[PDB]
Amino acid sequence: TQTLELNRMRGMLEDDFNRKKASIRQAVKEENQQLDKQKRDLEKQSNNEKLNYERTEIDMVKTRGQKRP
Amino acid sequence: MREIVHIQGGQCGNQIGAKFWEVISDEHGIDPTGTYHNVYYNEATGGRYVPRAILMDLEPGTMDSVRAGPFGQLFRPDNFVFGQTGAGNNWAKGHYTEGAELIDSVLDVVRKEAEGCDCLQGFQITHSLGGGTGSGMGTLLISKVREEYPDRIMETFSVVPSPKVSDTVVEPYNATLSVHQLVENADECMVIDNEALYDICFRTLKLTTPTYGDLNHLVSAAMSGVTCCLRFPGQLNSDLRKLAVNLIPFPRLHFFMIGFAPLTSRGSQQYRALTVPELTQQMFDAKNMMCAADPRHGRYLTASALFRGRMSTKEVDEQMLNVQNKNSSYFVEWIPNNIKSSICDIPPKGLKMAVTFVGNSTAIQEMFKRVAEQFTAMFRRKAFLHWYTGEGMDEMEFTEAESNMNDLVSEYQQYQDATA
Numbered sequence A: 001t002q003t004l005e006l007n008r009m010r011g012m013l014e015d016d017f018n019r020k021k022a023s024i025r026q027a028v029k030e031e032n033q034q035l036d037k038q039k040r041d042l043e044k045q046s047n048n049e050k051l052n053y054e055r056t057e058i059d060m061v062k063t064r065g066q067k068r069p
Numbered sequence B: 001m002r003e004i005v006h007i008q009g010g011q012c013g014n015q016i017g018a019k020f021w022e023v024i025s026d027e028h029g030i031d032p033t034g035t036y037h038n039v040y041y042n043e044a045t046g047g048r049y050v051p052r053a054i055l056m057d058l059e060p061g062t063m064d065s066v067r068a069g070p071f072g073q074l075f076r077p078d079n080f081v082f083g084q085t086g087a088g089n090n091w092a093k094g095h096y097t098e099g100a101e102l103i104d105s106v107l108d109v110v111r112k113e114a115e116g117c118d119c120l121q122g123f124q125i126t127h128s129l130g131g132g133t134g135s136g137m138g139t140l141l142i143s144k145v146r147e148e149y150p151d152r153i154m155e156t157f158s159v160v161p162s163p164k165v166s167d168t169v170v171e172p173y174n175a176t177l178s179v180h181q182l183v184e185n186a187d188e189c190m191v192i193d194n195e196a197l198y199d200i201c202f203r204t205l206k207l208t209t210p211t212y213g214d215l216n217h218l219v220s221a222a223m224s225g226v227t228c229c230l231r232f233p234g235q236l237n238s239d240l241r242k243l244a245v246n247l248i249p250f251p252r253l254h255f256f257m258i259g260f261a262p263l264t265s266r267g268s269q270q271y272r273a274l275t276v277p278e279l280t281q282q283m284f285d286a287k288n289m290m291c292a293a294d295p296r297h298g299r300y301l302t303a304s305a306l307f308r309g310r311m312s313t314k315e316v317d318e319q320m321l322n323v324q325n326k327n328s329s330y331f332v333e334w335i336p337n338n339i340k341s342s343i344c345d346i347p348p349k350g351l352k353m354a355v356t357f358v359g360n361s362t363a364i365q366e367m368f369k370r371v372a373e374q375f376t377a378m379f380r381r382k383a384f385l386h387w388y389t390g391e392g393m394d395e396m397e398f399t400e401a402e403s404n405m406n407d408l409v410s411e412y413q414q415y416q417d418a419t420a
């Protein structure tokens, strides 16, 4: 009975340790998923901003007609 | 902080210098009264900024010129050293009789500028070479300041006369008389010529009626972009000497070429992007440099390129390596990695990327060649000689100057020959 009381100790401790480590790994996976959104969004913002700026530049250039004094 | 003195001789040099000071003011946002809106400017009591420059000519008319255009109100009257006659296109006047009568005062005020300064790095000169005032008085000042300030380096943006653009007919004499004296007391004689500027402004930007204004604008742009990697931070900084070591392996092979990018017109700017591949594909061409010496007719002993804006050093350096491993025929082999870059984190007003390119090539000898050529067909007949022999000038000057021209061109020729 004592050796069973102790083997269940070992078993419970190990089947808790492993679940804890797997939880840590899942948390790291979530952290990387989160980090991905930064490079997903900053690039979108910079793309839209380049679009706006270069469109405004095209406009300002094209807005040169004739003077006719 | 590595201050710079700014000499402007002759009418051409003075107009170009006015253009350059107004471009600089456009860069650091200094309205034409000298208020905000120390490498170039000096503080005057009241927070005013007076450009640390000095102007000179023998015809006070040019005075009024620099008082006409905007940003003319900046320069200080305590540096306006001027004559009365005007060198009248002759090199004798502005070097032996009348020039030497004003070199004293101009050197005095230059000493007043320099001795007050503590961190002085290098000089800079803007002057024609056929015009008597510019060529003569400027080369005399160069001789003086370089026998007095030996260590520091020089910069003479000499605007050489090209023959296809005819202005006067005494250009070769003054040209050679200047170039013989430039090769000793000046370490960086970066040449420009109105032929290349006319060609560029015609067939690169479709300008309708180009006048000297926009040409001086382009030269001022190049001159600013040269040292823009000094007054502003950058991921890989450079200065005058970092240029002046990677570009000149000898005490005589110190004659350069200039270039600037990018340039396009309204009806054409909707089609080109702005990345270092495109700027590189534009800057190394022939119609994108400001010297009438076809670069593909030789090689480059060396070349540096100062970028302005913010890019990823990898793209710049890979583009350099690629263009060096592609046009290897137009490059020289006995010096490895014969190109150099310098990234600077400040673009010009209104752009994102800009390139100022300098190149020591073995193809500009041709230029000097043709000038010396004219000399022959104007010296064997001894034409227009008495205007020189009347002011102590003797015949040894012309013959030894042509000798030195031949020596220089043979140097560049044998280095085009020199391989390994």
Ligand SMILES: Nc1nc2c(ncn2[C@@H]2O[C@H](COP(=O)(O)OP(=O)(O)O)[C@@H](O)[C@H]2O)c(=O)[nH]1
Pocket: B009, B010, B011, B012, B013, B015, B016, B057, B087, B088, B089, B090, B128, B130, B131, B132, B133, B134, B135, B159, B161, B167, B168, B194, B197, B212, B213, B215, B216
């Ligand atoms: N690109 C350009 N060339 C100029 C300018 N002004 C003069 N040049 C040339 O300079 C040459 C004459 O030099 P100049 O200074 O007038 O004679 P000097 O006063 O005796 O030295 C001529 O070939 C002019 O065409 C300018 O503003 N821009």
